[PDB]
Structures are given as C-alpha cells and as structure tokens.
C-alpha cells in the first residue's frame, strides 16, 4: 500500500482501487493518475500496477494505459520490462485498431531491446488488412529511423518502405514517401530514391485521389525532385496546377514551392513560363483572406516570392493595402510588400497611404512607414523631391521616434543621389532634434563627413561627438579622413589636432582590433602620400541598387527551396535554429 | 530593505500588494506577472529564495496562497522568511483559522496587520502578543 492520495480532503488508496474489480473506479483512478501526470506530478511509482494488471476491458483502459506508457517510456527498462512481453504480444490481436494502437505506443519507446524485440510485431503488421495499421507502421518506421542507426533489419525496413511507396492506399503511400523524406533528413547512400517512371505516376494518382493532409507530404517530397524531361515535366505541372484545397494555406504554399523550384526554362521565351505566372496569382492573392497566422505565413513567403520573381503580383497591389482591423505583423508585412511592389504606375495610390500611415499609434509601424517613405523615394524616380519634402515635414514635427528613423532613409537618398540634394544638410544637421540612436548617429556622421564643401563648420559638429568616443561608430574616423584629407591640404597647419586625435584614439585607446586595424591602415596611408590617400579613399563610388531592403542572393536561393519551411517565416538561414 | 509584499494565489489574482519603493503603474503591472512566473513554477523541493536581477524574493506556499517578500541582497533571508511565517501566524491567531476567503473578506484587518508589522521596508514589531493586544484594543 504505497502512494496514497486524497480526494477533496479524504484518505483513500489508489493501488487497491486499481487492483479492485470495479472497472469504472479503476478508470476514474487512472484518469486521476493521468491528470496528475499532465499537471506535472511524479506518478512513476504506479507503473507495475497500471501495466501488469491489464485484466479488464480492452478499449478505453488500454488506450489510457498506452498513453501512460508513451508518456513514461523514458523510465527505467527494469521497471518497463515487468509486462513488456505481454505488451509486445499484440500483433496477433483480432482488432486492427488495437494492433495499430499497440504499434503506435510501442514505437515511442527508445529502449535497448527495441531493435531486437519490436521488429517481429512491426513486420507482422506491414502487409496487413486495415490501411491505418500500415499508416501507423510507416509512422513507427520513421520514428525508429529518426535515430538513423543500423537496426537488426533496417535494410529490410527500407525495402519495405520502398515497397510501400508503390502501393494501393493514397494515405499509406503518402506516409511512406514522408518516411522516405524523414530518413532523407541525413545523407545516406540511398538518398532520395526516385524510381521515376512508375513512382511519379503513382504519386500523381495518390495526389489526385488523396485526402486533405497527405498532399502536403507528397508535395514536400516532390519539391526536392528535379527532372530533365519536357513532356513529363508538363504532365507534372498539369497534375500540380489544380490547387484550391480546403487546407487553404499549406497545400497552396507547397504547390507554389513545387512550381517555383520547377522553373527551368527560358525566362522570357517560354510560353508556359508566362502560363505559370498567370497561374500563381489567384492563389497568391486569395491566400490572404483567411486567418491571421496563415496570413502572416503567406505574407512572409510572398515577400521572398516578390524578391526573387517580381513579375507575379506586380499587376495586383490593391490586395496589399493595409486595412484598420489587422494585427501588427500583417500590418508590417503588407506595408513591406507594398513598398517592394511600388511600381511606376501606382505611386499616387502608394504615397497617399504612405503619408497617412505616419499618424498611427503602433510605434514600430510608424517607424516602418517613415522608412517606407524613403524606400519609395529610392524606388520611384519622379517622386524623390516630394518624398524628401514629406520627410522634412515629418522631421519638423520634432518626434523622437520619427526623426531618428527618417534621417537614415535620408542618408540612403543622399547615397543614391549625390548631387541633386546639396541643400538639406545645413538645415538637418543643424537641427539634431533628438538624442539619436546609433543608426541615426551613423547617418548624421556620414552626412557630415561627405559633401564637406558646404558644411565648412563641420569641425564643431564632429568634435561634439569626438569627446564622448563610446559607441559603435567607425564612421567618426572613416568619414573624418575622407573630408580632412582634402580640407587639411587646402588649409595647412589646421585640423592636425583632429586627424591625429582620432587616430590616437583609435590606436591605443580603442580595445577593438577592428577599429585599431582601421586606425593603423589610415595612419600609415595619409602620413606617407597624400595623393595616394586621396586616390584610395576619395575615389568615386558606384550607386546602390533600386531595391533597398534585400537579402543576399545565396540566402535567397537557399530560401527558394524552403518556401513552405519555417526558414521562410524566420527569414534566417536554416542553421540558425537547431 | 523590503521592496514589496505580495499575496498571490495560484489562479493568478493578487490579494495583497504593498509597494514601498517608487514603482510606476506599468512597473507594478509587470513585476506582479514576473513574480507569478518565477514563483508559481518551482515546487516545494526547491529553495525559497529567487533572484530576479538583484532581488532576493522569499516565498512560501500556504494552501494556494503565495506569500512573497522582496529584498535586496544584503539582509538575512531566513530572518525575512521567519518574518513571513510570523506574519502568517499573526493573521492566523487574529481569527481561529484563516484562508483566502477570510483574507479577501477582512482586507481592512489585513492592511492593519501589515501596517502594524512592516513599515518603510523594515519590520515594526517582531512580537505577536503586543500586535494581538493592539488589534483587540483597536477592535472597538
């Protein structure tokens, strides 16, 4: 008589109630045990009284006992082997539901006797009658193959998986190809066994006559496939093309992944390329009218789709304007997709909503909008003066979280156009109407350093920052030298106490080796040959690209194949979350 | 010094909150949730002292109620833990027995006991008999 618990201020024994003949009281007792297990108790001292006492009715009590076993399979095998023989003697039961439940609760046990005592009930239910038994069998095959270890009959398990790929039931063959993709997570010798001219047709017939869940795994394993034929490829695209399934988002984005990775043709001469461009846009537009979470996932994938191929949602931008009853993530991503799709024919529709979004209440959304105005200024050619005037009017309101983000996109406009805006500096640097965050500080310091012919009192504005030399800004030297490598030559015996003070601060005061190496590279250059320093530092620079907030092309080609994956939502490399 | 005294049940409500330092309204809304998320997860087989950034929050669990007294890391944690238990015993002996329903229904007596026990981050009276005599004299 051990592990005595209470009931609302009473005293009663659980083990006598478990061993009693009252099956309803035993069910209530094991329900209380499972409730304690869910809330987080240590009920592991009842295992030989809940396992070996399996003498009552089959279905509900056996399901609860198997739930207890699949929850506490990480326990000791000395306690787990009390009735494990009668546990694994369940592949000859008359109920295939009981057999499938026994297989599904035996697969989660990572014990040393698993590969020597579970291969016979697994192989005794592979070529079974009920398809759910084969479904659970392939699930447990993938579960045992998750360790990727050489089992007792692992080659026979892989051969049975290859046989189950070409079988009758569509959910069974979908789960089998999903298990092949799961064992294909590593790089074995038999990685991605295609067996094209029969398995492709079998997978297409399974996709045509499948349910609303196996299509995701089928298209997931189809996404990594890369053929080389033409008529076979067109038949694959024709079978893939009808996709408006009831699972409104996952199947659609997996089919978009298949169609975008399945793009190996002429990018301007293939008529079927234009057919696919016409095909992708009704799902990529009607995908947004659902629940907010799959809407956010769809927007994060549509951002990568637009960054790679801009000619998909180019003619449809009215579905990307933000309404007033959306959450913050949809509100940000619709804005970013809108300012990426701001073309040369919708600027009047874009700019009114852009100047309207600046008066909102979400602080990060207002920051994204005041960066978005400058990004639209970089994008549109004949709107930069109006957007510069709009940014100056927003700065003149003297808002702390608006000026510190507006001066960065103003610096981006100055970098894109180096001659047409030589009048904003003497006002904007003279304002400094905040205590700027380091991005705005770097923007201010670079704007002061460049264009030095019109900011000739820059020594005071640089020495205001030069005293407090504690931030992450190497611009205070790499922009000081690029201007006072010519102003110090035009005015000798002048600003030596700047072009040597910042080098003495970057030589033996800054502990950062990057800043120290920049200081030594500058100090060994301008102190030897001023014409060479003017040729190296003050050379002409090329203009930046039009699309500002881009990712690297290698990471974009990485995220092309992972459109349905979580790396598309995180916008990170897939080795950033292991 | 005592920064705050909290009575939090396991459901999530706050029954008694005394704040001796200068906290804002958002700070008072955030520190209650942080105290709940730190305290109401650890079981009885752990310690009774938790650290937040520089805190030494001392908690006990009396029948679903969670008594928390915060301090900085300079003072005797067992002394403040037994101060918590002495305050719970004072609230017990004010009645014949006490619970969460009694602490809700007699909060005007609870604040009287707290103001006659703790003040300005320190302890006012270590004893219990004089506090019971003061409560019986103020009962009229």
């Amino acid at each position: 008589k051990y592990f005595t618990t209470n009931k609302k201020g009473e005293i009663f024994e659980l083990k006598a109630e478990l061993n009693n003949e009252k099956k309803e009281k035993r069910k209530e007792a094991v329900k209380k045990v499972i409730a304690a297990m869910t809330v987080g108790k240590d009920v592991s001292s009842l295992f030989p009284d809940v396992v070996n006492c399996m003498q009552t009715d089959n279905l509900e009590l056996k399901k609860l006992v198997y739930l207890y076993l699949m929850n506490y399979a990480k326990s000791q095998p000395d306690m787990a082997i009390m009735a494990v023989n009668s546990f694994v003697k369940d592949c000859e039961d008359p109920n295939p539901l009981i057999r499938a439940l026994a297989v599904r609760t035996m697969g989660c046990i990572r014990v040393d006797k698993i590969t020597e005592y579970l291969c016979e009930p697994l192989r005794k239910c592979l070529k079974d009658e009920d398809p759910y038994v084969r479904k659970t069998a392939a699930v447990c095959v993938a579960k045992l193959h998750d360790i990727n270890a050489q089992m007792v009959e692992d080659q026979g398990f892989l051969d049975s998986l290859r046989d189950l790929i070409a079988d009758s039931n569509p959910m069974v063959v979908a789960n089998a190809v999903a298990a092949l993709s799961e064992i294909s997570e590593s790089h074995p010798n038999s990685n991605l066994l295609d067996l094209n001219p029969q398995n492709i047709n079998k997978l297409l017939t399974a996709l045509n006559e499948c349910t609303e869940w196996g299509q995701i795994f089928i298209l997931d394993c189809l996404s990594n496939y890369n053929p080389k034929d033409d008529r076979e490829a067109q038949s694959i695209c024709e079978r893939v093309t009808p996709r408006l399934s009831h699972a409104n988002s996952a199947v659609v984005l997996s089919a978009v992944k298949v169609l975008m990775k399945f793009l190996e043709l002429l990018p301007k001469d293939s008529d079927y390329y234009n057919m696919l461009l016409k095909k992708l846009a009704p799902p990529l537009v009607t995908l947004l009218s659902g629940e907010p979470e799959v809407q956010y996932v769809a927007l994060r994938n549509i951002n990568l789709i637009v960054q790679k191929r801009p000619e998909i949602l180019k003619q449809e931008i009215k579905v990307f304007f933000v309404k007033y009853n959306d959450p913050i993530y949809v509100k940000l991503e619709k804005l970013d997709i809108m300012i990426r799709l701001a073309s040369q024919a919708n600027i009047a529709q874009v700019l009114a909503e852009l100047k309207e979004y600046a008066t909102e209440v979400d602080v990060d959304f207002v920051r994204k909008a005041v960066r978005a105005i400058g990004r639209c200024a970089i994008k549109v050619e004949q709107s930069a003066e109006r957007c510069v005037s709009t940014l100056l009017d927003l700065i003149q309101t003297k808002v702390n979280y608006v000026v510190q983000e507006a001066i960065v996109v103003i610096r981006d406009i100055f970098r894109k156009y180096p001659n047409k805006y030589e009048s904003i500096i003497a006002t904007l640097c003279e304002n400094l109407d905040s205590l700027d965050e380091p991005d705005a500080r770097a923007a201010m310091i670079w704007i002061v350093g460049e264009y030095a012919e019109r900011i000739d009192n820059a020594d005071e504005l640089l020495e205001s920052f030069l005293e407090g030399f504690h931030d992450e800004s190497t611009q205070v030297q790499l922009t000081l030298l690029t201007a006072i490598v010519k102003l110090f030559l035009k005015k000798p015996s002048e600003t030596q106490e700047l072009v040597q003070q910042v080098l003495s601060l970057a030589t033996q005061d800054s502990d950062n080796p990057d800043l120290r190496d920049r200081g030594y590279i500058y100090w060994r250059l301008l102190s030897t040959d001023p014409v060479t320093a003017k040729e190296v530092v003050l050379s002409e620079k090329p203009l930046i690209s039009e699309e500002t907030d881009l990712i690297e092309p290698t990471l974009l080609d990485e995220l092309i194949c992972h459109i349905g994956s979580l790396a598309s939502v995180y916008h990170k490399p897939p080795n950033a979350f292991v | 010094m005592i920064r705050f005294i909290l009575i939090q049940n396991r459901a999530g409500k706050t029954r008694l909150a005394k704040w001796y330092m200068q906290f804002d309204d958002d700070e008072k809304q955030k520190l209650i949730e942080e105290v709940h998320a730190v305290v109401t997860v650890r079981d009885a087989k752990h310690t009774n002292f938790v650290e937040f950034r520089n805190f030494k929050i001392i908690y006990r669990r009396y029948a679903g109620l969670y008594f928390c007294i915060c301090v900085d890391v300079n003072d005797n944690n067992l002394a403040y833990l037994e101060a918590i238990h002495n305050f719970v015993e004072v609230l017990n002996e004010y009645f014949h027995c006490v619970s969460e329903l009694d602490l809700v229904f007699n909060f005007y007596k609870v604040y009287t006991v707290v103001d006659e026990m703790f003040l300005a981050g320190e302890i006012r009276e270590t004893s219990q008999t004089k506090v019971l005599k003061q409560l019986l004299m103020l009962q009229s």
């Binding site: 609302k8 | 006490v98 619970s99 009694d102």
Partner: peptide, 10 residues
Amino acid sequence: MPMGDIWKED
C-alpha cells in the same frame, strides 16, 4: 468507524 477531518473552514 472513523470520521472525516476538518478540511474546510465553515
């Protein structure tokens, strides 16, 4: 023939 403990305050 035992009785029940006083668990609740009346």
